[PDB]
Amino acid sequence: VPTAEETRRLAQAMMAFTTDLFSLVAQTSTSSNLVLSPLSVALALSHLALGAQNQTLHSLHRVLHMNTGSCLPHLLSHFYQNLGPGTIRLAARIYLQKGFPIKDDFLEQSERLFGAKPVKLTGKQEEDLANINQWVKEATEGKIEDFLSELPDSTVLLLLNAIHFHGFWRTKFDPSLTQKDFFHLDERFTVSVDMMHAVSYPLRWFLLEQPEIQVAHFPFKNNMSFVVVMPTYFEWNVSEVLANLTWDTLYHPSLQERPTKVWLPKLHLQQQLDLVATLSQLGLQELFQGPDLRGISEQNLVVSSVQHQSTMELSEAGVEAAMSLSSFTVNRPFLFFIMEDTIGVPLFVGSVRNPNPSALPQLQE
């Protein structure tokens, strides 16, 4: 159990890391939508931290904005383990090449904190790929299938990270009210989406005036929230929007809930990403050329690949059932945060520019 200041520091650190990673990926990537769990990446990097030493260890702390007096694996592991089950499925494993002996201390520690020991690769592209995917299928409990994709050899240390999110609203949506409706890609073009609907939903919703951004909080059951950040104009980027956000924008808005007509798209977002380039740019380039990971093996490791996948689903599922109201209509591009509400750690971030990439856009009148 960590201190009140210790979790306070972790929230601070994880927000800084989330911000850093999200921005970098946002400008690097070409995909229509974005979905990342910088937390999950942080947990994965804590695997490395557990076996890192000297400047490698230092750099891991520095990049994750973590105080070097605290223990990354313990903090992150403990935080995740205490989330309460059934909403986030997470898979984090270290895979190592055949000729690399692992320190017994590192196996036991990986076991204690991460639920499983790192695996040694057989040395055959065919057999290893199936074993990996099977284990990721098992650890996400069905949700994530066929993780990779491909595998070289040409492989020393592989760090795998897959995460699946599907939550339960504190207040459910009535699935009989969901309809195909217009989502505006821009001023002229629309796409059709399954629009969830509530006639009278309890909503904490407000405006950031000068930047022209609406913010709405949709509470999940287990001390989590889906926070919609929707600029009221089309031409924006992730970095400039983030720059306008504060802590109380994302965390514990004091504003009373208010009955609101709501339209919110169903979502099924999925991004897979090699983070070698991204993490190198953030300050971790030495991991991929000559790190000090003597905690794992006495000689002589290098991180070959950091493979991350986030899958997030939004649907009607939830626990509670129960003059004109105002309307909140999520039918413009937007940015989201999934927060944990007890302490303020961001679990997922993403950007939705098109909630139905397959659909043929329509030119509206």
UniProtKB/Swiss-Prot annotation:
Expressed by the liver and secreted in plasma. It comes from the Eukaryota. Its main location: secreted. The record marks 323-324 as: Reactive bond for chymotrypsin. One of its GO terms (molecular function) is protease binding. Glycans are attached at residues 54, 223, 237, 244. One of its GO terms (cellular component) is fibrinogen complex. Keywords: Acute phase, Disulfide bond, Glycoprotein, Protease inhibitor, Secreted, Serine protease inhibitor, Signal, Sulfation. GO terms for biological process: acute-phase response; blood vessel morphogenesis; collagen fibril organization; maintenance of blood vessel diameter homeostasis by renin-angiotensin; negative regulation of fibrinolysis; negative regulation of plasminogen activation; positive regulation of cell differentiation; positive regulation of collagen biosynthetic process. It is found in: Secreted. Forms protease inhibiting heterodimer with TMPRSS7. Belongs to the serpin family. Serine protease inhibitor. The major targets of this inhibitor are plasmin and trypsin, but it also inactivates matriptase-3/TMPRSS7 and chymotrypsin. This is Alpha-2-antiplasmin. It comes from Mus musculus (Mouse). The gene is Serpinf2. The chain holds residues 73 to 446 of 491 of the full protein.
